[PDB]
């Protein structure tokens, strides 16, 4: 199981997340499962639902062992509900190894399971502190390093077209070129990490930077979108808008609701800004950017209907629940999430974005005397 074989171990669809090939039980029950780090706990379907083309079905794996514990997850978008248990996991195209791992066996779900996204559990890669229904529940990462010699840290390299990979207990320096830059780890419960500076086109935002990170920003690849704090999108919109004036779209496209088309092989991408992020770095004020293209923030979606154009939504939304660097952030970067140094490692991918006049990139060093904590 070496790092090579775990290259394009990852599928999805945009807007759906990216999911790993697993198997549960014995005899293993093949399932595909969001990569999120954004939760933390092991969450599958283990009942018929009409978005799942397969689920857990416990009465036939002979190494099940129930909890006697449920558990009721409402979150602000949707609920599941379920029966945690521990049972064998493994990933067929991860490391070569089988775990007992806690799983909670989802029972009941409310816009929980989408139609079509080829996904039918959730592998929470987050810490115990936000795992449902407390912290005692050790997350499968956790169980992972414990049972086996695979070191304390993994990787993702998500690409937009959707594939990638995610690779365990080490860095597949093929992934990326040049520098890794990194993002120490706030505290670990999400992956919280502090954002310094933002600008838009070179302009920078001009706020408190404590704004960047009201109440937390976290890097989650369980979310599709840049989710910003009010104040933060309010600026960045006006910025964008300004920036892409010779062009007018509806407040709705804005809003993240309605699409914006264009004629096949015809977008305007040099009308819309690029944005930088300014992480914290490993050292007293010092930071680096990650520089976001539009062929990230516009998400295209796919429609065989709509397939005379090339149509997209407006990636970016507002929060208020913080900063989350989603899939879209994600995208084109091969990001190290290296829980053994707590830190986040930020790359350019071979799967980068770019066009004739622009690319992604991961620059740093930035110096900056005047700086407060930027931390809430
Ligand atoms: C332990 O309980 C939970 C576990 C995971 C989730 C969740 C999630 C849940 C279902 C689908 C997705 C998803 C949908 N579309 C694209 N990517 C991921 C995300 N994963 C996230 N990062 C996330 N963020 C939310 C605001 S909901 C949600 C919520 C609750």
Same mark, same amino acid.
């Given at each position: 199981?070496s ?22 039980? +014995?005899?293993? /029950?093949?399932?595909?499962i ?7 706990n ?19 794996? +002979? ?42 066996? =989802? ?20 810490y ?28 993702? /390299? ?26 120490? =780890? ?30 937390? +920003? ?39 609701? /309605? ?26 004020? /010092? ?6 293209l ?6 295209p979606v ?32 091969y ?42």
């Amino acid at each position: 199981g070496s790092f090579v074989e775990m290259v394009d171990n990852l599928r999805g669809k945009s807007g759906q997340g990216y999911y790993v090939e697993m198997t549960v039980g +014995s005899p293993p /029950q093949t399932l595909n499962i969001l990569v999120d780090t954004g939760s933390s706990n092991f969450a599958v379907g283990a009942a018929p639902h009409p978005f799942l083309h397969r689920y857990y079905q416990r009465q036939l794996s +002979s190494t099940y062992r129930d909890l006697r514990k449920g558990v009721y997850v409402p979150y602000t978008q949707g609920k599941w509900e379920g029966e945690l248990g521990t049972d064998l996991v493994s990933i067929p195209h991860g490391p070569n190894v089988t775990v007992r791992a806690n799983i909670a066996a =989802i029972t009941e779900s409310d816009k929980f399971f989408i139609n079509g996204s080829n996904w039918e559990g959730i592998l929470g890669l987050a810490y115990a502190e936000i795992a449902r229904p407390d912290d005692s529940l050790e997350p499968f990462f956790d169980s992972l390093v414990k049972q086996t010699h695979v070191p304390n840290l993994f990787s993702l /390299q998500l690409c937009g077209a959707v594939g990638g990979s995610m690779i365990i207990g080490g860095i597949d320096h093929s992934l990326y070129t040049g520098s890794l830059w990194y993002t120490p =780890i706030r505290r670990e419960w999400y992956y919280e990490v502090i954002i310094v500076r933002v600008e838009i086109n070179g302009q920078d935002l001009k706020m408190d930077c404590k704004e960047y990170n009201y109440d937390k +920003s976290i890097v989650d690849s369980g979310t599709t979108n840049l989710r910003l704090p009010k104040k933060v999108f309010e600026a960045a919109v006006k910025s964008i808008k300004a920036a892409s004036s010779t062009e007018k779209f509806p407040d709705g496209f804005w809003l993240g609701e /309605q699409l914006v088309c264009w004629q096949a092989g015809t977008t305007p991408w040099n009308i819309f800004p690029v944005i930088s992020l300014y992480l914290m770095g490993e050292v007293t004020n /010092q930071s680096f950017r990650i520089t976001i293209l539009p062929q990230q923030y516009l998400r295209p979606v796919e429609d065989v209907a709509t397939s005379q154009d090339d149509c997209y939504k407006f990636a970016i939304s507002q929060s208020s629940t913080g900063t989350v660097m989603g899939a879209v952030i994600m995208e084109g970067f091969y990001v190290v999430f290296d829980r053994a140094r707590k830190r986040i490692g930020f790359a350019v991918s071979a799967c980068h974005v770019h066009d004739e006049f622009r690319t992604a990139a991961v620059e740093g060093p930035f110096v900056t005397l005047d700086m407060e904590d930027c931390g809430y």
